């Protein structure tokens, strides 16, 4: 494990309501925008290109194409800022880090579905 004390003191930070997912899966991440006093949910939908780290430190990255410009959002996997995550599609890929997608566009960047 990680150091027992670190795990013990960070255990209550961990969320237990997250679905399983893998790089190459398409996610809809419902994110709480708390601008001012008004709070709303903005959905960021894209392919998971990266998952790294462990415990409360774990992060994941999702990539989308917006108005022709690639955008990548990285979240702490356990952030309370995420209302929920939906696994829209399961991808078929051959490696943990899909950095090669950054250089691909259009049909070249499509991920086969499982």
């Amino acid at each position: 494990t990680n150091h027992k004390l670190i795990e013990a003191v960070t255990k209550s930070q961990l969320r237990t309501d997250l679905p399983s997912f893998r790089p190459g899966d398409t996610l809809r991440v419902h994110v709480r925008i708390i601008e001012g006093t008004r709070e709303r949910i903005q959905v960021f939908e894209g392919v998971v290109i990266k998952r790294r780290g462990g415990g409360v430190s774990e992060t994941f990255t999702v990539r989308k194409i917006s108005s022709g410009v690639g955008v990548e959002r990285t979240f702490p996997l356990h952030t309370p800022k995420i209302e929920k995550i939906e696994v829209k599609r399961r991808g078929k890929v051959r490696r943990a880090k899909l950095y090669y997608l950054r250089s691909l566009r259009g049909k070249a960047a499509r991920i086969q579905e499982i």
Binding site: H3, L5, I6, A8, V9, T10, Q13, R32, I34, G55, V56, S57, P76, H78, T79, P80, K81
Partner: protein, 216 residues
């Protein structure tokens, strides 16, 4: 004003009340005991001596610092405590609020307390001017034969010497460093740990001293 001794466990993070990501250092501060009370009358100044982390009892043919020697065992037994690995004085506390032999629990601090944390920074060994002192390199090309050297060490006939304080290669790190105005994010009395916001000097397992921040 408060004080305690602990070991640096490592860094992690916690999510704050608004979801802000707070980097934290975990400090394990079990087994703190007030061993001695120093006073202006006896010692010329007021302070509490705190001993941290029980070590093993004296034994005849001890070969490491794991086992207390006879002087240390007598010193701790006078406080009615087990002998301790690290011993430091706190002058910033009110001596009248402590009794010799008393425990100093992590609960002395509360979340939100602003603190100064002192440790010995990580050692780097023998280091050159670029790393040790942050100097600029010479050109890496254009015929240069000056890359990581320290540069001119003086002027000329005036002064025909190098001034004290000249920055030169030498041993780096391993220095006492105080970081001011950190914050106590959390106190876990069951685990005897304090979560301090940010980072503090020293390697993991390093001794750290936490005090109420001097500046206020």
């Amino acid at each position: 004003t408060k004080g305690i001794l602990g070991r640096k466990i490592g860094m992690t993070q916690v999510f704050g009340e608004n979801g802000e990501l707070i980097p934290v250092t975990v400090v394990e501060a079990k087994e703190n005991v007030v061993l001695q009370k120093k006073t202006v009358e006896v010692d010329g100044y007021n302070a509490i001596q705190v001993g941290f982390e029980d070590k093993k009892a004296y034994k005849k043919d001890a070969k490491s610092n794991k086992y207390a020697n006879k002087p240390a065992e007598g010193h701790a037994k006078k406080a009615d405590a087990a002998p301790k690995r690290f011993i430091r004085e706190f002058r910033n506390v009110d001596v009248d609020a402590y009794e010799v032999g008393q425990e100093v629990s992590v609960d002395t601090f509360v979340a939100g307390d602003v603190i100064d944390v002192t440790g010995v920074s990580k050692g780097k060994g023998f280091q050159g001017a670029i790393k040790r002192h942050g100097q600029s390199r010479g050109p890496m090309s254009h015929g240069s034969h000056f890359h990581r050297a320290p540069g001119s060490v003086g002027m000329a006939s005036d002064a025909s010497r190098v001034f004290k304080g000249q920055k030169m290669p030498g041993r780096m790190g391993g220095n006492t460093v105080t970081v001011q105005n950190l914050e106590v994010v959390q106190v876990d009395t069951e685990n005897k740990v304090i979560l301090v916001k940010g980072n503090v000097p020293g390697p993991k397992k390093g001794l750290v001293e936490i005090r109420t921040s001097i500046k206020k």
